[PDB]
């Protein structure tokens, strides 16, 4: 039960640049390692076998080498499709041990988000509960902040955020900030806005709506 550890986890590297990730076995595995590219969703795919031999059908970009403990999956040129969570497997031992999973993020040119606000539907208002959904769409980098303001009053300790695993076609992240609020409190207020703060935004530009106006 040799434990394989991958250092580090977030490896964001600009396109064309070499992304070099590690995997340190507890025991010695003597050039008996494997590397995988498990893109968001897709079941893992073999990359390097025998800790060196690049599998056929995979580009030379991936060049693996090391023995015993020091393992390094190298990527001489980085692309948008290369955004994936990577795995190292030992096969010295009969079972097969895996690593943590080094996520590689393609470093992109900073582009600001296209923000949209979502007032609740009357079907959800029938159920009592109401949800306001601030939508930040396709921006770089993942690092962004979403705040709230029901009648300017910042709604804290309530908003649930959800972010998308970086895009292939553009290398951008998109996030949702769902805000749950019961009809009784929802009706008592009119001002509704999510405040946006990002590296693209010159100043934090917020999109707002009022309960009555539709």
């Amino acid at each position: 039960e040799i434990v394989l550890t991958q250092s580090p986890a977030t490896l964001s590297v600009s396109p064309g640049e070499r992304a070099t990730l590690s995997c340190r076995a507890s025991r010695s595995v003597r050039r008996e390692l494997a590397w995988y590219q498990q893109k968001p969703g897709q079941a893992p795919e073999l990359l390097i076998y025998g800790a060196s031999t690049r599998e056929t059908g995979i580009p030379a970009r991936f060049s693996g080498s090391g023995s015993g403990t020091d393992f390094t999956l190298t990527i001489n040129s980085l692309e948008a499709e290369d955004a994936a969570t990577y795995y190292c497997q030992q096969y010295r031992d009969p079972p097969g041990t895996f690593g943590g999973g080094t996520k590689v993020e393609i470093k992109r040119t900073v582009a600001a988000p296209s923000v949209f606000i979502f007032p609740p539907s009357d079907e959800q208002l029938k159920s009592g509960t109401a949800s306001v959904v601030c939508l930040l769409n396709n921006f770089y980098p993942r690092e962004a902040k979403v705040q709230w303001k029901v009648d300017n009053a910042l709604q804290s300790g309530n908003s649930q955020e959800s972010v998308t695993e970086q895009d292939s076609k553009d290398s951008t992240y998109s996030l949702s900030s769902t805000l749950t609020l019961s009809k009784a409190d929802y009706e008592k207020h009119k001002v509704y806005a999510c405040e946006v703060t990002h590296q693209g935004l010159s100043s934090p530009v917020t999109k707002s709506f009022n309960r009555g106006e539709c």
Binding site: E32, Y36, P44, Y49, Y91
Partner: peptide
């Protein structure tokens, strides 16, 4: 992993 090599995971379901 064939004769040369123990156990590599070729394709995943």
């Amino acid at each position: 992993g064939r004769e040369e090599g123990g156990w590599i995971f070729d394709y995943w379901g």
